[model samples]
Target: ENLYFQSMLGRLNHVAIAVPDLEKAAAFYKNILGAQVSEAVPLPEHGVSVVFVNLGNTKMELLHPLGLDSPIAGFLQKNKAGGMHHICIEVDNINAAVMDLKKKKICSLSVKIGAHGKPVIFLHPKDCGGVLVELEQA
Candidate 1:
């Protein structure tokens, strides 16, 4: 059987980890692992602050809630210690991928412009082996 959109997904863009403290997580990655870390940037629209840790081949994103109403805040309330948030994958054509996924009846919430200023959509974890999957335009 052929998968309609298997080949449309590209490289792993980044793995996002929600943290209670962005600075602390960045310090751990920088001081402990000696990773190259990017300056913390706030994405008010997304209601989160993020820092990127470059891992040569790929990157790890550290996310912290920007406000009490941020989604990460709720995640932390449940987890208490924060944890893996989502994995982002690259897509050659976001529109096509979205359409294909819709055609295949995949449970995608909706497409939105992400922090990177790219068209992105999140697949429901229930439909993706209990892992939140983010697809971003490459």
Candidate 2:
């Protein structure tokens, strides 16, 4: 049918995994999965330090809470485990998409910049049937 939109975004960027022990998680991807490792960076604003695993065209972000006040901590506490916190899909324009999502009755964790200095927002898990979703703009 050759369906298309005037402003269609591209593929998923990465799947964000929240973990209690980031070092251990990083090791798994690097050691077992053979993913190239990168230096970890702390994002105080987001309350976590992140490590990236280059997955060919995409990436996998492992998030470790830096403090008790971090949102990841709450997710871990609620889920009682650390895994697959959210799936982040890359977009050309985060603000526009966020507005569009809101218009569609979706909620966001916050409208703010994320660890990679990109505009990002998290969709309410309840709204998406209990799976956190992240939207990131390149």
Candidate 3:
């Protein structure tokens, strides 16, 4: 087996859920789902405040828009949509994965520094059988 191709380097960081209300989402994820909570963080750059849930080796990032310019706001405006916004899959090398995915005919949203300076690229849901996939490298 090819370890490099078959192995995913780390646990999923989070599954972002764009929501209209942070408090409400946090309540459900934390109280109902019983996911352990992390500290709430207000990310001005992204124009949202996030509350994360630690799910063993992974996490759930609940995103609530802080303003009209927020990306999450746009995602919500498109019809108050609710579903798995994206799936974060950690990797050992961002550049390598970007090239690989491109060679495999996958389109990326962008190659940029993501949360905590991790390099990330978003794979269009259309290409992934309707799941927005994120590749992150630290």
Candidate 4:
């Protein structure tokens, strides 16, 4: 019998960090750390502006509020200095992975096109040990 769920998840795609200033954070990573950084991209649908710091093996996604109503804005209000936001994991089959999560009673808040233009789902953090988890199609 085919297992209901195995290691269908692939490598870690990126670690998301919420920041008060996207350009400043990007500059810190690119200028100080000398990491390969991508230009900032505003993801209005997600309510954030983002930049990617490529680390060859994986990446760090820097996120800032796109508008005053952005979720990142609230996060920054609480954190003041910004902090780790969420992590993204790659899955070979997003539908299968979502089904598996549902079977375990883990409700997915939403599944939408992400910055990478791939189908992505956000799982409720309360059910996920207080850390928001993002699952993306590989």
lDDT of each: 0.90, 0.82, 0.78, 0.90
Against the true structure, candidate 3 has what lDDT? 0.78
> TM-score of each candidate?
0.92, 0.83, 0.84, 0.88
Query: Mind giving the per-residue lDDT tens digits that candidate 1 earns over 25-103?
Result: 9999999989999999999999999999999889999999887789778788887788998999999999999989989
C-alpha lDDT of candidate 1 relative to the true structure:
0.90
For model 2, how does the per-residue alpha-carbon lDDT over 11-127 read when each residue is reduced to its tens digit? 888888887788888998899988897778888877899998888888888888886799888788876668788888778888789778879876576678777788788887888
Q: Could you tell me which 10 consecutive residues in candidate 1 have the lowest summed lDDT?
A: 1-10
Least lDDT summed over 10 consecutive residues: which range in candidate 4?
1-10
Tens digits of per-residue lDDT for model 3, 12-34: 77788887777887888778978
Which segments of model 1 are wrong by more than 4 Å? 1-6
Which of the predicted structures, 3 or 4, would earn the higher lDDT when compared with the native?
4
Per residue, candidate 4 scores C-alpha lDDT tens digits across 24-62 of: 899999999999999999888878888999999999999
Model 4 off-target regions past 4 Å?
1-6
Error of 4 at 77 (Å): 1.3
